Design a protein around this ligand. Sequence first.
Ligand SMILES: [Cl-]
Ligand SMILES: [Cl-]
Ligand SMILES: [Mg+2]
Ligand SMILES: [Mg+2]
Ligand SMILES: [Mg+2]
Ligand SMILES: [Mg+2]
Ligand SMILES: [Mg+2]
Ligand SMILES: [Mg+2]
Ligand SMILES: [Mg+2]
Ligand SMILES: [Mg+2]
Ligand SMILES: [Mg+2]
Ligand code: NA
Ligand code: NA
Ligand code: NA
Ligand code: NA
Ligand SMILES: [Sr+2]
Ligand SMILES: [Sr+2]
Ligand SMILES: [Sr+2]
Ligand SMILES: [Sr+2]
Ligand SMILES: [Sr+2]
Ligand SMILES: [Sr+2]
Ligand SMILES: [Sr+2]
Ligand SMILES: [Sr+2]
Ligand SMILES: [Sr+2]
Ligand SMILES: [Sr+2]
Lengths: 92, 237, 194
Amino acid sequence: MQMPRRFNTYCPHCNEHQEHEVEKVRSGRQTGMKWIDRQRERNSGIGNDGKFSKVPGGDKPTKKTDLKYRCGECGKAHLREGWRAGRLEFQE
Amino acid sequence: GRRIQGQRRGRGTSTFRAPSHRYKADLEHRKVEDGDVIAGTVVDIEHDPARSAPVAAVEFEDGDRRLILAPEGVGVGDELQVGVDAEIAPGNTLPLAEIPEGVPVCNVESSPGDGGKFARASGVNAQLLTHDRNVAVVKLPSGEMKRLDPQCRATIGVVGGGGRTDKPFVKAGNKHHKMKARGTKWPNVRGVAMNAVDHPFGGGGRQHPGKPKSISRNAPPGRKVGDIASKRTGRGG
Amino acid sequence: ARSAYSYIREAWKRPKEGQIAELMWHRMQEWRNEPAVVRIERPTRLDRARSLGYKAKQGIIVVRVAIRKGSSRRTRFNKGRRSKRMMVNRITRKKNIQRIAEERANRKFPNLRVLNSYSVGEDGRHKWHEVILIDPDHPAIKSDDQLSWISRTRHRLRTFRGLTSAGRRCRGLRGQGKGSEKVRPSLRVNGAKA
RNA sequence: UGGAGCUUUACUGCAGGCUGUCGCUGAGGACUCUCACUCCGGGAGGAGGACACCGAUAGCCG
RNA sequence: GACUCGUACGGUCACUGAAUCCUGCCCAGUGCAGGUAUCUGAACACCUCGUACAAGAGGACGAAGGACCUGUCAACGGCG
Ligand SMILES: [Cl-]
Ligand SMILES: [Cl-]
Ligand SMILES: [Mg+2]
Ligand SMILES: [Mg+2]
Ligand SMILES: [Mg+2]
Ligand SMILES: [Mg+2]
Ligand SMILES: [Mg+2]
Ligand SMILES: [Mg+2]
Ligand SMILES: [Mg+2]
Ligand SMILES: [Mg+2]
Ligand SMILES: [Mg+2]
Ligand code: NA
Ligand code: NA
Ligand code: NA
Ligand code: NA
Ligand SMILES: [Sr+2]
Ligand SMILES: [Sr+2]
Ligand SMILES: [Sr+2]
Ligand SMILES: [Sr+2]
Ligand SMILES: [Sr+2]
Ligand SMILES: [Sr+2]
Ligand SMILES: [Sr+2]
Ligand SMILES: [Sr+2]
Ligand SMILES: [Sr+2]
Ligand SMILES: [Sr+2]
């Protein structure tokens, strides 16, 4: 389905309608310095490593939209629930 | 499963050991102080159990009686010599250097002094080819060009008992008797005729290996069976 | 002023530097062609020996001991084991080579008791430690004000019970506070969790 | 949501082999050398050589 | 340490199973082996960023292996 790159809508920060810009959320890199990162190292050893021996599961036939709605004025953004969409193209 | 037979071999039990207590003598070359001057007389010819080949008993001047890796042609009374100044005749032992190029040699040392390592089986022989101040090229019975220290001692001639292989065993019993004189477990049951628990090619309703026979060289003992690291197989091509 | 000993000490801070590096290259060749436990007339490291308790007196013996480097020489399990226990290559022993050296030294001298020990280098496969051993039954030792304590019947085979310097550090007893919870007053007493 | 034996490109691991790297290990992307170390020799000495063996670790096969 | 007081006319690993007449075609898949410009390929060391240091992110190099090519069926097997 298609969706406008920009459009007016409620900005929870300014607390009033403003023209937002929609963007698909890009993944942020990992530092590798989180507790979970340290635990994988602490708890891995000879033989099976329990949970750290499991491997990334499957996928769903269709994912929900993962977007950021950034306000054109104050510049801050907010998230919203997503809806399943086989494809999402922006207009302009 | 259970360890395969090739693994029972290593533990070196009676079943897999050679009848050493029945063997006569390693036929390593005699050691000479130097300047040669060492000759002996062939007092008798004997049968070498461990090699199914004849061997000669020699009595050296200094009173030392030893069995020697006999080449073809040695007879009682004959006189053998071992040293650098040794006369280039069949049965004599001298450094590969003192041996003229183009002469058949046997019981060749791998390292000067080891007493001989190569070409000791029936009828075989190494052909000396190239000489030098650094290396002596010898052609081993396998047809391989071997580079040896020219100081490595050897015997002139081919090993006695040639053509031993020409005659067939004919019956199992004959095979039996020879096997009984070597470090070998005989007869042989094909792995494909064994239970799966006993060998990689075992099991199955009908006999046939359940895998390709060419195993990798890094295969672990117990798994390394069949055609080891084969570069090819069959005759075709 | 600095003592003559401080120089032996100083040299051994960096065994692969200076003259000693040269000395070690020398000695080790001889050490390698030597036994497992060899009695020597004088400590290689005088400062260390005297510092550990050594004394130029009767009933005092010194011995160099060779031991293989590396992890544990472990045999692979011959019966069922969960993945966690099918381990062989990375398993290391809980006793350190030095403690192992003191014990071997002690067997050679069934009548002497280990007073202490220290390392004297290693090549790529050996590890050498010199062990100071004492003769509890010789006077001159009994009558000694500094060592007579090692004659007490309570000290019979102190090494095999880990009462040695190296024994106690290995046992995790070095700290008197944090971290020595399951260690003091003994490993066995804490359910063997240290 | 029993047991065991057996199988395999079932899941997960463990030996073993191959391969790189660090230590042993030294002198003047390729080379010479000798002094550790290795092998041959009864010995003198000979062959090899900072490699290999051994210790540690990593990738592949398993 | 066995093999081994053994050394290729040896002895290890496998298949077939006296003699006689014979034993066709297939290397695509799998297996083994060799080769390989390029691609890919770990750790140590090295470089960049980050941190007064460290964690960490990235880079260059690139072993065996793999991709790729070749050999091989009295290898596994196949010949509708
Ligand atoms: Cl035979
Ligand atoms: Cl003691
Ligand atoms: Mg035959
Ligand atoms: Mg058979
Ligand atoms: Mg059967
Ligand atoms: Mg059956
Ligand atoms: Mg099996
Ligand atoms: Mg059949
Ligand atoms: Mg068959
Ligand atoms: Mg005092
Ligand atoms: Mg079951
Ligand atoms: Na004792
Ligand atoms: Na602990
Ligand atoms: Na069963
Ligand atoms: Na094929
Ligand atoms: Sr841990
Ligand atoms: Sr693990
Ligand atoms: Sr799905
Ligand atoms: Sr021999
Ligand atoms: Sr010998
Ligand atoms: Sr089968
Ligand atoms: Sr053919
Ligand atoms: Sr006792
Ligand atoms: Sr036939
Ligand atoms: Sr193929």
